[model samples]
Target: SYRVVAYYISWGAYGRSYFPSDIDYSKVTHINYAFANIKDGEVVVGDPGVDDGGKNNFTALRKAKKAHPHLRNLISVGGWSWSSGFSDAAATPEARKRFADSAVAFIRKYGFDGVDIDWEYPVEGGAENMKHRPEDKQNYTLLTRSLREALDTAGKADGKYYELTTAVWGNDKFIANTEMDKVSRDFDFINVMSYDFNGTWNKFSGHNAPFVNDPAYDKPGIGKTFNVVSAVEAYLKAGVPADKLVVGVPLYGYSWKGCAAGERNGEYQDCNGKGRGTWEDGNLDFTDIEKNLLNKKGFKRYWNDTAKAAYLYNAETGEFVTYEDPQALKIKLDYIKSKGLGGAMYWEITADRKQTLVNLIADELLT
Candidate 1:
């Protein structure tokens, strides 16, 4: 009943050997290819190093769409790194027109059905040195309206509708940074990035995408703001229509080493640590977690009843990990249906090898 959307990272073609062809198109309805960068104030392929002009990934993405007519592919532009140019582009009408025109052309040229703006943030908190201004709150709205106008105009001429959506940050501060009322009204839907509630940035171990805030830590503003329940509710309270909201899920988790033991095996422990990463330091893939980390090698898994999440802690080494397993997905899936949301979306496709996380959403919610 809801859209099953998943992002397909273009770089995965190189690092993880993940190609668009490897995707099981049957499981997902929409694919967002991350990412195309903002270069010289225009939408450009993120990798200028690729001589083929990004066709290596774009072509393969379209091929997947060609095989599955029910599927829609979108070129997501301005992720964390590429977002630095957004402030400049949205600063002036001319710059906005330039960026929007290029996005329309890029979609038509690449055969993408839509465009997803992943400007990590609008007013503040993107890659270092990225420009931001107080005016960004209003400028962000104008920017999306410009993109919407351009997409609509192009769709009218081409006789096919083009969808416009954005990946929004998952916190109250992000809402304060933009006019969510105006912003939500301009796009098809807003994919709220309701994950990354906690990470290496903090000194304590916590869930990467916790549903509710654990009652254990009732300190202040930070504690209340860092959870999916708070985020989704805030968005609705801030004027985002429920049906236009898609809850984000993470197929990855962050780990902490050298953690000092606390209740429930380091759930809230001060620790200086790195990831026992199945991949990158501080990051663990779900597939790898299923294979090497979950309840294995002295890593015991525990569920947080209040937060509705699972964590792993190796009492000896003090390696504490947080991630979404099938049980966690089931809890989130129920929330999606109960809330009458537009859909559920996860970061990338490759992380869930056997569809352990997605398949549950499909069976429990989509059915």
Candidate 2:
């Protein structure tokens, strides 16, 4: 059977008016808590009241197991903003041992099933200020091995199951940075972050997570393999087992403003300003789009045949929204089944305020 993994952000428990208790545990097999930070060569709570540092959100989240006896909650460490210390910790034997030991202690104390390492990137391509080195390439494999050994020993001693997984980059450049075969052996599963291949950073507008690559997408200084199809192929070619790989979907869209009018509603054109968003600039939650933007306010949705993605455009306001809708998600589901891959996952659950996409997971993929 295919697995359904959902990521629940701890920060949302405060600012976003969301709590772990609000989750419908039946909708997913696993909940990857995002995230726990790496501090002073140890696994520390990223935020106090938000994470387990203060009164904490995990108390409610840990109780979720009672509602769904089979649900597995994994503590995710090292997100994009908090990834600076990964290279430092992974570079030395002493640091690796400390990190691994701390990981075991955190899981035991917090009552989590396992740990998910979310090192944004090993050598390069993380936050600009993040400490990175060329040797970070091999250190990454060693780091996973250390975490795996510690978890295994603790699991054997406690008579419980403990697992290690990772979230990896979504493109071929990622393949060039790490030891794929070795890293694959050290981790239980690999979550391919196949979204965000295109965003406001790009001069030309494109789909955030296209199912297939556009034929006319070739350009200088850009990689050709930037879609879900190529990301899966790259990982499989790197010796990652299909059963241990999970295809990721986005619950949000990348919005671009100040675009020119056209049949594509300014798509593939240069964007001048960032689009209106729910939380951050150039971002839109799926729930908000469904309520206000889809066909309302002069916005018309269009589908890209070649890329297998859904996008919205408003000629009047010049807002071009690229996202995944039910049809696009249905296509992604079919692709997962056809490839015999492990299963599918998404960025977050809180963004699905109405549970529309959550039900789609159960109806379309789980059933």
Candidate 3:
């Protein structure tokens, strides 16, 4: 059996108006709520009102779980923005125990089936201002081990197994930063964030989630080993089992503007900076792409056959957008099956308002 892990963002309820009740529980096996914060040596809710107050995300998640008995909900702790305290929390035995205990208590209180750690990066590579240390490489493994032990102890008492999983960076830097071989033992599965290979930060346009590396378009340094296939292969080589690696897809895309209309419709061309988006600059949701960008308003869709990815290019506007659609997702599903990997995981479920990509995932993997 394969796992369909969908990240449900807590902040979506504010501007996006996406609540847990809106989730189609039947389509997914696990809903990893993003995210809870690590504060003062313990796991804590990132937002009090949205996470636990009146008409909160937890209440709706509980209701959804009640309706769908197979759905497992997990609270994801620490994301890119809220990962500042992870270094201190995982520093010592006492701090690790406190974090682990708080995690167990938090899941038990919120009726979650497990806990998913999204520490961004163990030793480095999160927000620039976040704290990090050289020992974080070793401490990350210790933290996961401590967390697993805590969950197992609690599970034995409750007579129910609680899962422990983590979302990891999907590149060679991540491989060098943490001990995946030792850490994989503690996790139920590792969610490899295989997307975001390219974005506004790139000087040239490229795919956001390419399945395979395209030597022609791949930029120097980060682009060579930053695709989905290479990341999975690296994890496998690092001792993670094929069945415990989940490939991540993107529900949103990265856009660039002021690009030169060079070969292949602005691809590999120099761009001025980030393009306009549905909610913010340089980021656009699938819903927005489907409604406005896909082959509309001078934006023509193009596919990179070698990379097995899709993008939208506007010659007139010099806009280049890299995103995933049904076509790209179907190829990824084929790759997932061919590679004998665990399953597919997307960043957030709210981006696809009509559930187009969600239904495709269910039909391909869950059917």
TM per model?
A: 0.96, 0.97, 0.98
Candidate 2 per-residue lDDT over residues 1-367, each given as its tens digit: 7878899998787668888888888788889999999889899877887777554688887788877788999999987888888999999999999999999999999889999998878878877767888888899999999999999999999999998989999967778889888899877788899999888888667888988888765544556688999999999999888888888999988888877865566777777767988889888888888898987788899888898888888888788998778888888888888888878888888888887777888676675
List the pairs of residues colliding in candidate 3.
Answer: none
After superposition, which runs of candidate 3 have C-alpha atoms over 4 Å from their true positions? none
How many pairs of residues in model 2 come into backbone collision?
Answer: 0
The CA lDDT of each predicted structure is 0.85, 0.85, 0.90
In the range 58-161, model 3's lDDT, one tens digit per residue, is 99999998899899999999889988888899999999999999999999888999999998787769787688999999999999999999999999998889
Q: Which structure among the candidates has the greatest lDDT?
A: 3
Once fitted onto the true fold, the runs of candidate 2 whose alpha carbons sit more than 4 angstroms away are 53-55, 218-220
Q: Rank all candidate structures by their TM-score, best first, as comma-separated numbers.
A: 3, 2, 1
- Give the TM-score comparing model 3 with the true structure, all chains together: 0.98
Candidate 1 Cα misplacement greater than 4 A, ranges: 48-55, 218-221
Query: Which candidate tops TM-score?
Result: 3
Tell me the lDDT of model 1 at 253: 83
For each of the candidates, the C-alpha root-mean-square deviation to the true structure, in angstroms, is: 1.6, 1.4, 1.1
lDDT of 1 by residue, 279-299 (tens): 588888888888888999989
